[PDB]
């Protein structure tokens, strides 16, 4: 199924 | 001096709020620049992905190229390229005679990890008359300077005869010392219309 | 004089900041005002915005007249609608007696052609009293001026009575030369609320 | 006092143009911060911004509690939660030192109802170690002031050690006298990384 | 008599057959019309929606107009606007002179709530040289009945010359009573082909 | 005479009642009946079919032949074929003797051109063994009339000896003039069974 | 005895166009009725309706139990239950007192099977409280009848009270004699509202 | 996930 | 669920072709 | 989840025409 | 003879290589040929589905005629047709004179089940001036030969002109003896180009 | 000895042609094995097969279990496990009595690396009588010789019963050296159907 | 001669079992090649690839340049790019010496037009240090012979150094006279590891 | 939801 | 479950770019 994912590690900046 | 005064800042407000620069910029998306995104170099990939689809891990990145022709510049909206040399193909919305380009990136002061070591340092801006052709021609060698302010302006190189370009790649061939990636924010085309 | 003047420029900048007027735009979309769609002439289909998801392209738009009531206006960030004339007709986010009006186009330095041809020439702005009435009551005749400044401001004809209106008519009825089509980048509606 | 004056008018330009304060945001959603939602007060539900497709209705809008971390602050675009008083949990693109913080709403001269009774009053900022602690520690007591800036920043309690917090709560205990909701339209977090 | 009772029940049939009227319907989906949707009232919102997705109800609506102009009337086979007045928007199957039109509503003894007071009342009938034309041209006005039959058939102004549309708007300003909507159930277009 | 009257009234709407014609039709879809699609000739794309979802609309489409051998007769449900010949098979719902078949297409009175030159003029039907088979028995030669009544009933030729069909084919050689298709509403088979 | 005639046609004709019966139908699925599926009997599952699309099979087609309150009635638009005695329950559009029932089943002289041994024939209709309640108050015992009319009437029995009804569970206790399943082709539910 | 509703509440007619 | 199934069949009808391999109910 | 939900939304704004039937928060 | 060995061995290998013919195979799908599959016949239907949705299971099919057009003939890779006749329709890449075609099974030596029954075993070819077309030209009658060869070629029929054709039909009237189904590997067309 | 060389040269061609063994595979998953993933060996996850999508990266690649009974060997088309011992099991497409087993390697010849560190070296095959039987009856222990042929076979043990399998496992108890991983490029299983 | 005539066969099939050639392609994509899809020139848009998902064809696509990295060599399974001249970089799967280059296309006897003027004629390879370089080493200058074998190798210039690469380009100045397009079926790169 | 099935009997070859 | 990644991976398969960050297993 669809399933959104948390990143907890910062974006590129 | 009070009028003179209002004066200047008046004029100050006016350019600032003018794109900062009061000048055309051919590459904006909004107004007909577009990145040809299969001639990019490839996006930084990031540790994890943002979603899953039927268990594998799927999208493994932050921002496409087209965030370097948009104007918003707060921290984050910048595309993210492996390593630190990269390359970016951008379609202007009109067939000019390139006179000058600008980087923009964020200031130390905003950076969250204290330094701006992923902004792009030395570049070259070719004028390409098909995307598929292999060698530009060069407008410029340029470095952005990470002492300087946070939107820069570079000259075009002053030619002979005048060719016309609707398509240019800006090369990045280093940054200001980040190993993993490079960040552009973004890069504006100037110049005058055929 | 210096104390005097960080007081002219803090004044100047919080104006700006306070969407460039310090007045309460009562169209505005995000403040409570909305396009009644059914009452609009036919969009240009320009098909000039690119639509994708996670960065992957998916496929070319046309602005709305939604784009008349939100602050944007970067180059192509408008509402074309087909030839030189035209009507768009707005609710208000209140029931408000209107003192004035405010068109935006961007300026002659930012656009790619060098000038502003489908900017919006001659108008009126009318009072409906609900979105069925036909006939409004005239609320003034205009002329958006290509030589001014980018945004410009328009008084209403103040009636001898006070009639509130919650409905407003905006009729383009030429433009500054354009063929195909006109671009409003902005309108707002300024009054006080009964 | 010419060049003075240009010399203030740039100065107070590159500061507006720094996100007002020329200060790291560590909450701001592009930069890495993200909202918590299963630790928010209720968002405030209306049924009165109908989205419609082809004329058929098709959902109510209203404003998810990540707009509190970006940065446009025209009116409308808060987050609304329900009743006066509320909560709201931040994890921090990085851990800090929190240092100040920063409440912006719009000013009343923009607001179409007149007023800002809907805008955030009483309220406290805590410091949370893990996403499952219900207090945490105290970082300040503070008043947002609705006859004073658009923008307002707070300094944060100065303890003898300083702990490092890559979460931050902040609890509204009071609005300026709106019945039906509190509108949130943005908080920023600045400190030192580690 | 009895052939003649015979000829009098066939001929009864056979214009039963015909569509109740014997006469084309140029605004009939299946034979060429279409609803201009974009340029209709906006279908009326139920309490309830007809799914949801991701937590956030979608669709709350029963029919789209389309129904206007397609045979089948059992109860609830109608379009339902706001409120008592409104306006649909159709698209002829060819470029006619109109003679008449049709509206059909339920009769009472099928109503579920014993009522038809959701049945038009007062209309008016206008054709349309482009569907974006603001003013239309008056073709008639009229009075459904709820004391009369079913289907009910009006007749088109008198005109000296003889303009064709293949465009026509039907406004209702009225129904019978109910505070919520309006549903129509069938509108037809007669008239001669040019 | 009056008992007579009603007596003569209900026969003639039972009879309409049963299908118009109170004859089992063999051919009908939704009793048992199916199209060997793949031995029909072409499709016309007429792509007058809407079709749409949740109110949506989102594609036009033709009508396939299944049309053919469904009850819906208003203008346009009907099956468009290329040119002025074609042919299609359709197994029975059961093994039957074959007695008439009958060919509807609309009045006049209800085409929108005033004609009916797309209908069917010369056709033939035969009778197959097995859906393979090539050369089947004739099963009669007909016209559909055009100044007839909407339904017209046509006798099979009886052979001597009594062969059954589970497979018919119609054969249309002609039309009533119109370049581009046929239309046929719908085609029904009747007979007795084993 | 000629307008007397005409009178007595247009009389039947009008009933007939209502429905058939003059009366609402508290179970009309358009007009709000809807089946509990998870309180019916076990659909009769054939694999020999085969959908196929681009001739790759697709699934195997069967109706479901909401025919049963649709009002098309040609040959195959039934349900068909497993066996020969089973059960339906309806949930109608108002609460009312319930007065009467209509079957409808096909004509024999419809049915491509020479026989309707597939109608129901000994039934019951039960009025319940709530979903889960599963015998409920008897409304009346009845038989369709095969000989007789294809719709049939039966009245409710006369009780000292009268309770109201929004579910009615009609049990089928036999068929006329099929050994594979029954099918239902229309239930119809009579009464007065709240 | 997709997930239908139902209504409990009468159409309009 | 099935209110799902429906609506695509629905949107599938008018594509699909349909065979019937042995009589259906009637 | 409603990370799904907001880029849907991202989708629909454009092509989607929002009424206010009473004023929003603001 | 050792370089005559050579030579042998290298012309053999030479020819395996040229897809075991060294001729064109104008039906071949990557070199321009197509399955219209709408003229082919139905696809075998397997016992289970490939997937269920909504608790519906769809697809019950192995291959599509595709792979008749396709190199691959790995036991399996075949598309299967219910019974022992059918139809194949093929577009080829050229239009051609047909020559030869050729007809390739498993060997019985690959056979999980020990047999090839369901090859094709008597067929014929046709060509078609047109895929609607309803009777084609024979080019050959032909039996695939259990006993034989994995891949058989037959010769077309001599003509006495010269019909190109762009369209072939290959008819299976007869497999190797499997009652449920006919399994075909690979079909080529080989011949001319005008 | 001419005709003997054509002879010997198509002889080995034709056993070429036959899956290179002429033996049914009962394993190959295009006739019907596959794999039960579940009771395989983990994956070997490298995150270095990037698979983008407009230079978006989108995913990681890496082979399934599946390329085990699939024919192709090219390089790097096998599935590769975690570290030097491991397990697949496969389901076959027939009960069989199992008499013989094939490996395939790439040879070193064809390898980038030099070298076939990462063939299987010992193993052994079981019978399964259900899929969560974990041993199972022991059918043979072999080597796969890294100095032998590309495609190996393996003579299953001679018992004085003969028990019938559709589920075998194969153990690798070590690989040639590999340190990271074991990479399986095909497995076959021959023997006598029941 | 019988046991050395089944050696030579012996010998030439093993050959051609491993690639036709016995020697590592170090392009190849499944072991560790790679396109460098920016640096190739333009795709020819043919689309006469068919895409299709459970037998259902979807939409009709062009090969891109991966193909000429993969080993099916069946007529139209090669990526064409605009033109006749045009240029591809591959990354190999290791960082050699390269030795020789294989070129292969069909042969003439495959191809439906009787000619292979698609074919590259006049090309040459170079050596590339790193991905971003533009001026390469060129490793050898060669033309593809239409009148020769399907595959053809190429010997590299050896430089008296040895400078090894781990990115090839191939430059293709010249086609067999096809005007639209160049079609490339498959480039291997030979050589020794470092 | 969209779900997959095994088949459990083998293919036609 | 993974039978539907796979006939997913059929579909992206000729669309998607291919890069090789380090060898493959062979
Ligand atoms: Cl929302
Ligand atoms: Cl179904
Ligand atoms: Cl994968
Ligand atoms: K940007
Ligand atoms: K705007
Ligand atoms: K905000
Ligand atoms: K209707
Ligand atoms: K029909
Ligand atoms: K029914
Ligand atoms: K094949
Ligand atoms: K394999
Ligand atoms: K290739």
Redo the contacts with the bound molecule.
């Keep these: 199924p669809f399933t959104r994912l948390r990143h907890n590690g910062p974006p590129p900046v | 001096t009070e009028a003179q005064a209002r004066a200047i800042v008046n004029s100050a407000l006016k350019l600032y709020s003018q794109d900062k620069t009061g000048m055309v910029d051919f590459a904006l998306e909004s107004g007909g620049g577009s990145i040809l995104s299969t001639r990019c170099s490839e996006t930084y990939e990031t540790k994890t992905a943002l979603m899953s689809l039927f268990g594998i891990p799927l999208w493994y990145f932050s921002q496409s190229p087209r ?2 022709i ?4 707060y921290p984050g ?2 595309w993210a390229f492996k390593g630190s040399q990269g390359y970016l193909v951008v379609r202007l919305s009109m067939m000019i005679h390139p006179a000058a380009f600008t980087l923009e990136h964020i200031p130390k002061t905003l950076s969250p990890t204290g330094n701006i070591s992923s902004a792009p340092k030395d570049f070259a801006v070719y004028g390409l008359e098909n995307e598929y052709q292999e060698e530009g021609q060069l407008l410029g060698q340029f470095t952005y300077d990470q002492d300087g302010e946070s939107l820069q302006m570079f000259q075009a190189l002053k030619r002979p005869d005048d060719t016309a370009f609707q398509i240019v790649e800006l090369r990045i061939f280093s940054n200001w010392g980040h190993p993993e990636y490079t960040c552009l ?2 890069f504006r085309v100037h110049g005058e219309p055929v």
Tied chains: 1, 8, 14.
């Design positions: 965030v370097v948009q104007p918003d510049i909206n910048c924010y973004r």
